Design a protein around this ligand. Structure first.
Ligand SMILES: C[C@@H](NC(=O)[C@@H]1C[C@H]2C[C@H]2N1C(=O)Cn1nc(C(N)=O)c2ccncc21)c1cccc(Cl)c1F
Length: 225
């Protein structure tokens, strides 16, 4: 997260770190007892999910690392595109829920949110241009950027489909390692940080997030498998 601040520890109990050989790979979001939603491009290394965490490195009572029974990339995702950029990770078992570990309800109405709606993105992604990686969860409050402005020639030039949304990227932004993490608006999961490479912190190139409501049938179908 560029230009953010350290998040209050365990105040987002749905935040997950998707890990590869015990190193942070992507954000994720606990959406069901046994399921973490993330981004398609995040993923034969050992993939785990860390829940209840603030620090990646430090012992915390709430911290628990879950093996993953199944990784289910969206079957229409493709490298070289950020369409359908979701990933569902079935944990080994139902996560132990408590104050620091709780599923986040996700948006089912497939309608756009208000322009400028202040949403919250958290992650363990890079925090500056040199690539400094934070130990502790960061977050940033970002206003939603309407899709029309996001698609202007000087911006993302028509690339933003109705299944995607944008937020402002003006020095504050998601960045590398934030992919797969939550964009939370009005207390509900609205979007998932995309996981294609993109410039961070450039106000002319907004952050892109996948609209979970647009993918309800997919999510429902995979969570009930
Ligand atoms: C392990 C490795 N993880 C990744 O590269 C993940 C894993 C794989 C999906 C792709 N990834 C991304 O981040 C993709 N991505 N998304 C955004 C975005 N939306 O702004 C972005 C902007 C710029 N470049 C890549 C970007 C990592 C390297 C260094 C530090 C950290 Cl903290 C870290 F996690």
């Amino acid at each position: 997260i560029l230009g953010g601040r350290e998040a209050e520890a365990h105040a987002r109990p749905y935040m997950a770190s998707v890990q590869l050989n015990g190193a942070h790979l992507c954000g994720g979001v606990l959406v069901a007892e046994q399921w973490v939603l993330s981004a398609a491009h995040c993923l034969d290394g050992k993939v785990q999910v860390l829940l209840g965490a603030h620090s990646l490195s430090q012992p915390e009572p709430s911290k628990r690392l879950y093996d993953v029974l199944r990784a289910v990339p969206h079957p229409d995702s493709q490298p070289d595109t950020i369409d359908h950029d979701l990933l569902l990770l079935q944990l080994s078992e139902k996560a132990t829920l408590g104050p620091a570990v709780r599923p986040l309800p996700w948006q089912r109405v497939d309608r756009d949110v208000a322009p400028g709606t202040l949403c919250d993105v958290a992650g363990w992604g890079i925090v500056n241009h040199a690539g400094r990686r934070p130990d502790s969860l960061q977050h940033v409050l970002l206003p939603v950027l309407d899709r029309a402005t996001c698609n202007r020639r000087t911006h993302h030039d028509g690339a933003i489909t109705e299944r995607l949304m944008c937020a402002e990227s003006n020095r504050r932004d998601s960045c590398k390692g934030d992919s797969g993490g939550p964009l939370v608006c009005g207390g509900v999961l609205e979007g998932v940080v995309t996981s294609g490479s993109r410039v961070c912190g450039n106000r002319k190139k907004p952050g892109i997030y996948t609209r979970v409501a647009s993918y309800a049938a997919w999510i429902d179908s995979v969570l009930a498998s």
